[PDB]
Structure 1
Amino acid sequence: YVFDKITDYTSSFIVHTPRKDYAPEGEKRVELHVHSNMSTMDATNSISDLVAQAGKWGHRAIAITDHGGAQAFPEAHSAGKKAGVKILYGVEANVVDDGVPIAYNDAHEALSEATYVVFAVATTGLSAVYDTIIELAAVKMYKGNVIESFDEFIDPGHPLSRTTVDLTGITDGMVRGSKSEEEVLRMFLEFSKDTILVAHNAAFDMGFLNTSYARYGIPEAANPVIDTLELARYLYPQFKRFGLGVLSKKFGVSLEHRAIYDAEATGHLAWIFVKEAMDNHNMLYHDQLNEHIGEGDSYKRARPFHVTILAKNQAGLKDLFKLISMSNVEYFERVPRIPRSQLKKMRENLLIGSACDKGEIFEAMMQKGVEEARNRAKFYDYIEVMPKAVYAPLIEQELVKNEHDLEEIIQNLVEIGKSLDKIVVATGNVHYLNEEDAIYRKILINSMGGANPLNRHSLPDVHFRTTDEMLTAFHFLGEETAKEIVVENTNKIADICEEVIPVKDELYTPKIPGSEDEISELSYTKAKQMYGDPLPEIIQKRLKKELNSINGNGFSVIYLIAQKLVHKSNEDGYLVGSRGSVGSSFVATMTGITEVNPLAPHYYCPECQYSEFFGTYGSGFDMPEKQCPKCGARLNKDGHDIPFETFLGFHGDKVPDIDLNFSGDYQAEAHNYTKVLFGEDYVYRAGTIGTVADKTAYGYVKGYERDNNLQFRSAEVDRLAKGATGVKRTTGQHPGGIIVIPDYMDVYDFTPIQYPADDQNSEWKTTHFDFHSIHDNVLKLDILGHDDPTVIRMLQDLSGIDPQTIPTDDPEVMRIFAGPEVLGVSQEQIYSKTGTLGIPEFGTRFVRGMLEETHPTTFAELLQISGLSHGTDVWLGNAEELIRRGDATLAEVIGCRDDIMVYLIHAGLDSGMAFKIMETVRKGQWNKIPDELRETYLSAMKENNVPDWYIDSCSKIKYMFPKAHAAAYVLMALRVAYFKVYFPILYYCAYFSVRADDFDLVSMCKGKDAVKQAMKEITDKASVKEKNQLTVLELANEMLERGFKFGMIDLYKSDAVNFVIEGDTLIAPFRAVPSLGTNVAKQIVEASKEDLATRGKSKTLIEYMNDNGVLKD
């Protein structure tokens, strides 16, 4: 089979009828237990392909039930709508019994004075139903002292398996000659009279005893019982391990596992436990031992079991989301846990199921008996019986002795269900699609090793089974029973559930009263202040069209939130930049959200509010410095000719998207204000599902071959890797996204919630679903963090210059981009043609060579450089050769999509056609577009006399950067350049303190020679770290060549993270010193050489300073 590379399903190399459901059309099964790749590191197939498979097999419904999550619900919805297959939305939850009693036969005896027969049993196994006691020990204890002892051996007819001979120190001879049970049971019944039975895991030992009793018609002997396991859990929740040995060790009790020892050990503890129960609490009787049960962290110590929960109706889906959210947020231990009481409250619209062999019913039937399974099954709505293979690992694990006993377990479960009038269904616990895939799942598990108990044994065959396979597998039950539990009951369960929709259809934005009016008032107030009450026609038309598009579509909330966030940012003294197309909005400019002005190049008078508008000038900043005609003030200039259609789309029917680069420091404050704005219960950090990628998958595959010692063709490694790829590995938060839920709706109408990476200490909750499926229905606010706003603010603190006052039309920043002669350093010295090292977006070697080659000296030319840099194929094979060959200037070449549109409309082409042409070129689809469309575009361009090179340039373009983000980058660059060109020490301090994280401090402090040698090493090389060090070292060499110097870290002159300035030397932060740490840095700031070492706690860092000359000081 060609998987890229041809696979025979046996091996791989480097140079078919699909599975069919043969059942009749109406007699197809419904698969009710499906695990997708959203079950963390458990299943490997996407829900989409499972749903597609089901749609080819004619099943009328399928159920998605992942392990503790619903993260495959949106993809499942899409797949079910494509395949015409009904989706039942469920989860495989880990449910913990809320209340597990400590005392079993409630009685009003006094614990301090009662007689305890602390007993124990050696066994042939764990299943009281299919294995028997091989020994019986007990110690009658009083007042904490032993009174009597009863130890006996019981001989099973079969020889003891080597497992028992080892687990239990009992051999066949050891019990070769022993009394019959009937007799040993009667002896223990008389011995255990008028006493309080005691056991560790008293459920296990009481079930065995009662089963043995019932084997001879002996009375059940229901005297009061105590389970030391539960008592220890309740009394010492602090412990995380409660096994006898562990507990015996903790409380200093000695044990080798022979029943006699076990018994004496439990007794030596049980005395302590009962004393603690009587003293530390008010439990002086047996009954009082059960009063406080299932209260508190009880969920944390309980052992979860698998349950299947299916949403009955849309209310049921909301309830499943609330249960998933609570299991993630309130009842999480090493897994999302649902207390059984919570599942009972919310079950009117939930069909609860018995799940798999890890369920309560299968566990009870295989280890406790039909009556316990019949009582537990009372709580479920349907019973799940899987084909024997799924239960095959149990036989290999020796839980079920043979195929005869396993057939007895499945048949009993079918009967118990008919008896209680419950739907019994065959499910399949599907974890993969076809059987060739099994190895896919096996290669994924092996990676976890001892973490996954599934490794201890072999994995089952959990593959989607056709209807006939399931029917044939359960045929062992009978003919009118297999067809019932496979086809009829499953379809009955499917018909019970009403159609559910997990994802909404429209966008639900928050409501702020007076938002449209507020946005209009802000925009018009700013416009009047900048251009006068008799507003110019151009600005009038722009504002009217923008505001009609915004307020008309109900998007004023997006702009209003953006405005409040940016205003608060300004009040704290932080500039907010933007990413995307928000700068294309003049309402965004006037409301203060953006600093880019999308208007046409224009002059405006600061005092008269006069105005003149112009495509002769590419941008207003690139215009003569004229003086106001009306008065003597220097006319201000602005405008970058950015249409709003790029942001609000043609016709303005598009949802505004405002990504704001707030400072890295202030992002927390911004998110907290988004909470204040909408409430702590309606804002959630966005969520991302980190999965396994091919590098990791290849690693896991190679690890399997090494561990199992099997060679694979390299191509087989490749095929196996492409198959373990896409499996959920973890969950994360988006870098700065926040999702807001309308106060007239709750999060559960959209998604469950959780903590990122399941960290319960997280200050924010994330959405359970991907932001990629909830962002078309609720507002996703991108409050991103960027280092640029952190640099400008510190430069303002260091210099006082208000950032806005800085002029971006300076006549020396163009010089910075032409050459370093403005800086006062030679190209030979700074090792770069342009003195733009460290100017945001203008210091990468590639972009620096682009500048050296084209020598731009205008704001429009700098925008073209930024576009050439963030566009694929727009330059290396496009405008780099059109410029070197001399065909076109830097200004003429295509650099941004908005530039494409403006030029096509600067020429006679109609605006609508250009928008279409701009979109086509932006999406790298010009080649893809059919000749009819390409011909319309070509004819229009030629009629407007479009230069022939332009069309050729368009054909090779892939992705083109937006013009507004480019203008933001260029403004930040020009402000940081003002300081670099005018106030160098301040610029250098800000850059290092905010961006530089890796300093070869000793080399930088030594002088130029050292930095030069260090750069050579990197030049000869290299790891990401080496190149980061090389960028910091290059800025260091520029600063050193400029006469400024660095200083060694000073105990009384070094800030923890920020460089300090004295003359032309920046004192260095403690953070820079190799691994001086950040917490250690803060501690030093808070504060003999030994005394300093103490405040810091590291001897190794003390040795560093002792060698670099601070400790010498």
Structure 2
Amino acid sequence: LKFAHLHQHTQFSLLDGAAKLQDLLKWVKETTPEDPALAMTDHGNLFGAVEFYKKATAMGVKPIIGYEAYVAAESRFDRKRGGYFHLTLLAKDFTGYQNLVRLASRAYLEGFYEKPRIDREILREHAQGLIALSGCLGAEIPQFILQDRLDLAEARLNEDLSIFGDRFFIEIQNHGLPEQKKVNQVLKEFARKYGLGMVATNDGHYVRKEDARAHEVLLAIQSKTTLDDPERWRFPCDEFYVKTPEEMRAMLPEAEWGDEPFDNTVEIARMCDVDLPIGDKMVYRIPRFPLGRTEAQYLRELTFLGLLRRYPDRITEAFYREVLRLLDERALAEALARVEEKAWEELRKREWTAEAILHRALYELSVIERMGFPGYFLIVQDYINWARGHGVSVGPGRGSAAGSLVAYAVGITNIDPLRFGLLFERFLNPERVSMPDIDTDFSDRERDRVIQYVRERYGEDKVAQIGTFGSLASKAALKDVARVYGIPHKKAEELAKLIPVQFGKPKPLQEAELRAEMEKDERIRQVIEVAMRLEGLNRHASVHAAGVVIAAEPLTDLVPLMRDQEGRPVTQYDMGAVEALGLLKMDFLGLRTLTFLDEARRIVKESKGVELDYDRLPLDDPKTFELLSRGETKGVFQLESGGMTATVRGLKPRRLEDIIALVSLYRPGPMEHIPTYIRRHHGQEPVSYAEFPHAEKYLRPILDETYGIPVYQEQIMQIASQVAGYSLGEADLLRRAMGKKRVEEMQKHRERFVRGAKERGVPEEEANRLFDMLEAFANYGFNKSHAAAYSLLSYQTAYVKAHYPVEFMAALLSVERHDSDKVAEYIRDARALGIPVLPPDVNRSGFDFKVVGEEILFGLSAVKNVGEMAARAILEERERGGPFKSLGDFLKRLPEQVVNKRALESLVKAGALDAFGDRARLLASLEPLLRWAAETRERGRSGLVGLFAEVEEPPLVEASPLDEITMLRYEKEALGIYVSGHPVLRYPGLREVASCTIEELSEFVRELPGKPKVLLSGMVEEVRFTLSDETGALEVVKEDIPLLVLAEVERVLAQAVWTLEEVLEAPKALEVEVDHALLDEKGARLKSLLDEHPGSLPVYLRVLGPFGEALFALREVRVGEEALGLLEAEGYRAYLVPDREVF
């Protein structure tokens, strides 16, 4: 007696599936050793399919790809408020597989209501190659039976028989349930009346019977409730696990069911022959590129045309003519492309020169062509060159891509690969047929447009973004489970901090030595075991920020699809699964820096007429490196970390190569090589190769650029290629083998190395130890192509900041204009840098942030209630008529139709109309002048010339000037942020008591005790209230009311609060403010001054130190108030501040 589960749910039924793919497959294997089979039938998706197939296939289990469809009562287009039912589907052959793929796709793309649903219509369309089973209690037929509508159930049975023929089976499952008794009894009748054959399943959701509770809390994590609710999501019993053929019999007795339901199980599983194109199989699906041009000829064409643009001084028309005579501009390239490979190798046998460039380009093209990848390159070059001609910024390159001269020639890549030491062989290894990966950075604003270009260009049914599936982190798993079990957040957080973090992410609960915490409480015994039972599980299905597939044939033929919440078409398979089916996968990355460099160029142009051509800038500009050397890395790509900033100031880089090496080495591990780099860079330590005297002739040319240190992987490859005589491609393989650290296969390369090492130069004593140096530095060796390409963006960023500091800042503002916190921050950066940031102004402002002379000026679009049509209207009216002469002139030129009263109000409050006088006066003047303006047109559209049609605008309706609080209040309402001032700076009473400023918090607190308490004072901005200084804001647990706050810091948690009037009531203390410049004979000058006026006010001292501002409260001395006047009667500044003690 055997049995094969055909209705089993995995971790891929994301809401209720608890069976991990691995331990499920071993449990099936350990139960049934003979011809084991398992069907993956997940709730309305095909996510697991590929990984399930490849895990089961390598375990000797026969996988069966299945689908528990949600089937709509009527049509999949229904958005009816019947519902939807279940249906078990299995693919018996590959056409079956494909049809599942289409159905699963269509369920999401056409039929998604609450769940992804399909039709009996579309089922009928895609029924070929499918076995169907009557389904669980939630399915149509059993459901009808429960409702006493036997007529509908038989009618539906007929409908399905008309669809699937003899591939329809009556599905019979039994848990203790009383509904199952009634359903199965009637199902049994149907099965015998139509001669249908019953198949036993039991709808698994966990692996073993013990997993029932683990699964029950899983549901409580989706249901987001306590273990005791009730009404919390629960299954009807604890039976939904992978049962032994014996346990199955206990539910389905022999003297009542017979052998048929069991025998049919094994028979179906046998007749389910589905194979995926993986590993042994796998075809490369390269999409076709339209072009009397070969795919290989045109890539050649574009390369020759490219070099001429790329190396103007050394690759010219004259040069090409010579090469052809050694056997229009475009006509020569077109000709050179045809030259065959038998012809080419008859010229070589007869510093980067013209001839050198040809050879490298010709070599790369040779390798590309032979491997069958010219089509791949064409596709990539096409969409990148589109994006350029279409106002979409493109990075100089990423990853190994920039190592190819071809890539660089045809504009895939934008850094000179042979100027820097970049290697083609690191990108494509000539000695291994493997598809290259070309990732590309775009402006993060425009990236989607590039994807859209591809979608249109290659076909809507052939292009989708790749899906991603977050794993459940060990820490997060513990917290989620602990919630459910009714455990207080805090003691749970202490349990989560026990788990080690070895590389960014926490360690599996499998390993995790303070486990004696389980021994104490039996509650936590479960929590910990349950959390490791739920560890491997999945969250939901996001889009990959970068993944894109261009398939050769319609996607739905091999890979199922989805559509995310923003309408993006998404793959149901992940990164790897897609790639393991041999599909062309690209990365289109959104990059901030690119988007920033665009606004910079735009603003620069408008500011001073300069056309910033980033790809034509000199790379040896002094003022750029001097700025990096000063450590002014504030907005500079790649090097903004606290530590990194310090390192750049230390290094004082002078050429781009310093940036490349600095970025490569600054990370845990190589970090240590930087001091050495610096002393050698400063010209205060010789660079010596004495340990390899015979290898020096090879080592110097490679490692000189980087002061003897092997920093780059490319540097190693070259060393091994020159010393050992290795092919540069083989040196690549070597670096892979250094990285794998294969037990003793490393000793094979050793002997091979020394062989070629002797044969070349080194006496082999050096060789063995030189290989020791390689294996040492190959652990932390960096990919130079990636480093170099990125470094260029850093430079470009810094260069702008060096030469155009104001526009730089205005671009930083522009780029993050929708973030009130960042905008506030950037303003305070600019203001404390010499650059004034001004409120908008109807006469000078452009639409966005603008630089006038040497100031940054807010745009009109920045004003809160003003539409976008209105902002442009104002500007366009100002361009056809002159600058606005007065408020009246403004109101008659722009009717209320366009700039409504609400809009006008904000515009005043912003300061956009400040050129017309007092604001309070302007606000009041509005409605009278609106009446006036409306009345002018009445006379105007009733004849009346110009004197008869205008009793020219009355004076400004008078009112008292606004106070600072109310004026600043209006600004914020109108601009989101305060410009020129902050409400808190009006009453410095709070400033003085505050133990800190918002900015200084992190810096001040870190070094103190464990989880300290602190007092902060600022403004309130929430109906989790937000507190704000003139220095920043904070989350802390109504508006325009100042508060002092006592709170705990780890995030900030409030414990006590006092109002402005409360603080100004608590007894006051004298605070003197002393500079660092104070004599010995003062600290007893000041000391005696206070000694002579006793009382009971504590004395505080603000000591503005060299780095930081200390707060020394005095000692014994207690002044008696009068001392303030007599103390300000000398070179000392003083204040009567509220006493810090009370709070």
- Residue among 433, 438, 443 paired with 2:212: 438
Identify the residue that residue 383 of structure 2 maps to in structure 1: 565
Identify the residue that residue 410 of structure 2 maps to in structure 1: 591
Deviations 1:43-72 (A, max 9, x none): 122334323332332353211100000111
Contact 1:872 1:957 in 2 (8 A): no
- Partners of 1:1103 and 1:883 lie apart in 2 by 49
Confirm whether residue 1066 of structure 1 aligns to residue 856 of structure 2.
yes
Q: Alignment partner of 1:83: what SS?
A: coil
Q: By how many angstroms is 1:1050 displaced?
A: 5.1
Q: By how many angstroms is 1:455 displaced?
A: 1.3
CA RMSD of aligned residues (A): 3.8
Deviations 1:6-52 (A, max 9, x none): xxxxxxxxxxxxxxxxxxxxx42110011111101211223343233
Deviations 1:616-654 (A, max 9, x none): xxxxxxxxxxxxxxxxxxxxxxx1121111111143633
Q: Alignment partner of 2:112: what SS?
A: coil
- Partners of 2:384 and 2:778 lie apart in 1 by 35
Identify the residue that residue 626 of structure 2 maps to in structure 1: 815
Identify the residue that residue 197 of structure 1 maps to in structure 2: none
Identify the residue that residue 65 of structure 2 maps to in structure 1: 89
Contact 1:688 1:733 in 2 (8 A): yes
Identify the residue that residue 993 of structure 1 maps to in structure 2: 814
Contact 1:1001 1:1048 in 2 (8 A): no
Q: Give the counterpart letter for 1:676 in structure 2.
A: E
- Partners of 2:91 and 2:908 lie apart in 1 by 56
Identify the residue that residue 707 of structure 2 maps to in structure 1: 891
Identify the residue that residue 969 of structure 1 maps to in structure 2: 790
Identify the residue that residue 25 of structure 2 maps to in structure 1: 51
Contact 1:428 1:462 in 2 (8 A): yes
Identify the residue that residue 466 of structure 1 maps to in structure 2: 244
Contact 1:1089 1:1111 in 2 (8 A): no
- Partners of 1:468 and 1:747 lie apart in 2 by 43
Q: Alignment partner of 1:36: what SS?
A: coil
Contact 2:750 2:768 in 1 (8 A): no
Task: Quickly say closer, same or farther: Cα 1:51–1:652, change in 2 above 3 A.
Answer: closer
Contact 1:861 1:891 in 2 (8 A): no
- Partners of 2:802 and 2:616 lie apart in 1 by 16
Deviations 1:64-119 (A, max 9, x none): 10000011110111022112222221101111232xxxxxxxxxxxxxxxxxxxxx
Query: TM-score, length-normalised on structure 2?
Result: 0.62
Identify the residue that residue 478 of structure 1 maps to in structure 2: 255
Confirm whether residue 542 of structure 1 aligns to residue 332 of structure 2.
no
Deviations 1:1052-1092 (A, max 9, x none): 76667x5321232212468989xx69x97787667587445
Q: Give the counterpart letter for 1:576 in structure 2.
A: V
Identify the residue that residue 863 of structure 1 maps to in structure 2: 660
Confirm whether residue 754 of structure 1 aligns to residue 566 of structure 2.
no
- Partners of 1:722 and 1:993 lie apart in 2 by 47
Unaligned 5+ runs, structure 2:
162-167, 324-353, 493-520, 606-610, 688-703, 874-898, 911-965, 983-1143
Q: By how many angstroms is 1:490 displaced?
A: 0.9
Confirm whether residue 64 of structure 1 aligns to residue 40 of structure 2.
yes
- Residue among 70, 76, 101 paired with 1:321: 101
Deviations 1:398-424 (A, max 9, x none): xx4xxxxx5454344334313321121
Q: By how many angstroms is 1:698 displaced?
A: 2.3
Bigger drift between 858-867 and 46-55 goes to 46-55
Contact 2:867 2:903 in 1 (8 A): no
Deviations 1:728-767 (A, max 9, x none): 332121113321121xx221222111112xx3xx443112
Deviations 1:837-883 (A, max 9, x none): 322112222222232333332222221112113x552224x454675
Q: By how many angstroms is 1:906 displaced?
A: 5.5
Q: Give the counterpart letter for 1:429 in structure 2.
A: D
Identify the residue that residue 805 of structure 1 maps to in structure 2: 616
Q: Alignment partner of 1:55: what SS?
A: helix
Deviations 1:493-528 (A, max 9, x none): 223433342767122011114432221001012224
- Partners of 1:958 and 1:924 lie apart in 2 by 10
Q: Give the counterpart letter for 2:617 in structure 1.
A: I
Instruction: Show the 5 A alignment for 1:793-942.
Output: 793-797=598-602, 798-799=604-605, 800-818=611-629, 820=630, 834-869=631-666, 872-876=668-672, 878-880=673-675, 891-905=707-721, 907=723, 910-912=726-728, 914-921=731-738, 923=739, 925=741, 930-931=746-747, 933=749
Task: Quickly say closer, same or farther: Cα 1:28–1:883, change in 2 above 3 A.
Answer: farther
Q: By how many angstroms is 1:587 displaced?
A: 0.4
Q: By how many angstroms is 1:323 displaced?
A: 1.2
- Partners of 2:155 and 2:715 lie apart in 1 by 74
Identify the residue that residue 139 of structure 1 maps to in structure 2: none
Q: Alignment partner of 1:730: what SS?
A: strand
Q: Give the counterpart letter for 2:3 in structure 1.
A: R
Task: Quickly say closer, same or farther: Cα 1:308–1:1047, change in 2 above 3 A.
Answer: same
Q: Alignment partner of 2:528: what SS?
A: helix
Identify the residue that residue 1002 of structure 2 maps to in structure 1: none
Q: Alignment partner of 1:455: what SS?
A: coil
Q: Alignment partner of 1:298: what SS?
A: coil
- Partners of 1:1103 and 1:1067 lie apart in 2 by 15
Q: By how many angstroms is 1:339 displaced?
A: 1.7
Q: Give the counterpart letter for 1:725 in structure 2.
A: E
Contact 2:656 2:795 in 1 (8 A): no
Identify the residue that residue 774 of structure 1 maps to in structure 2: 578
Number of residue pairs matched by the alignment:
778
Task: Quickly say closer, same or farther: Cα 1:343–1:846, change in 2 above 3 A.
Answer: same
Q: Give the counterpart letter for 1:45 in structure 2.
A: A
- Partners of 1:1102 and 1:568 lie apart in 2 by 46
Identify the residue that residue 359 of structure 1 maps to in structure 2: 139
> How high is the sequence identity, in percent, across the aligned residues?
25
Identify the residue that residue 621 of structure 1 maps to in structure 2: none
- Partners of 2:115 and 2:969 lie apart in 1 by 41
- Partners of 1:943 and 1:1047 lie apart in 2 by 72
Identify the residue that residue 414 of structure 1 maps to in structure 2: 188
Q: Give the counterpart letter for 1:895 in structure 2.
A: V
Contact 1:660 1:783 in 2 (8 A): yes
Confirm whether residue 505 of structure 1 aligns to residue 282 of structure 2.
yes
Query: TM-score, length-normalised on structure 1?
Result: 0.64
Unaligned 5+ runs, structure 1:
1-26, 99-293, 401-405, 600-638, 821-833, 1005-1028
Task: Quickly say closer, same or farther: Cα 1:962–1:333, change in 2 above 3 A.
Answer: same
Q: Give the counterpart letter for 1:836 in structure 2.
A: T
- Residue among 458, 462, 475 paired with 1:678: 458
Contact 1:860 1:891 in 2 (8 A): no
- Partners of 2:675 and 2:707 lie apart in 1 by 12
Q: Give the counterpart letter for 1:1044 in structure 2.
A: I
Identify the residue that residue 3 of structure 2 maps to in structure 1: 29
- Partners of 1:526 and 1:694 lie apart in 2 by 52
Confirm whether residue 491 of structure 1 aligns to residue 266 of structure 2.
yes
Identify the residue that residue 617 of structure 1 maps to in structure 2: none
Contact 1:582 1:594 in 2 (8 A): yes
Q: By how many angstroms is 1:573 displaced?
A: 4.0
- Residue among 423, 426, 436 paired with 2:200: 426
Confirm whether residue 39 of structure 1 aligns to residue 13 of structure 2.
yes
Q: Give the counterpart letter for 1:809 in structure 2.
A: D
Contact 2:634 2:640 in 1 (8 A): yes
- Partners of 2:128 and 2:909 lie apart in 1 by 58
Q: Give the counterpart letter for 2:671 in structure 1.
A: W
Deviations 1:374-413 (A, max 9, x none): 4444426112222324x3xxx5xxxx4xxxxx54543443
- Partners of 2:488 and 2:656 lie apart in 1 by 63
Contact 2:296 2:374 in 1 (8 A): yes
Task: Quickly say closer, same or farther: Cα 1:718–1:527, change in 2 above 3 A.
Answer: same
Confirm whether residue 791 of structure 1 aligns to residue 596 of structure 2.
yes
Q: Give the counterpart letter for 1:754 in structure 2.
A: M
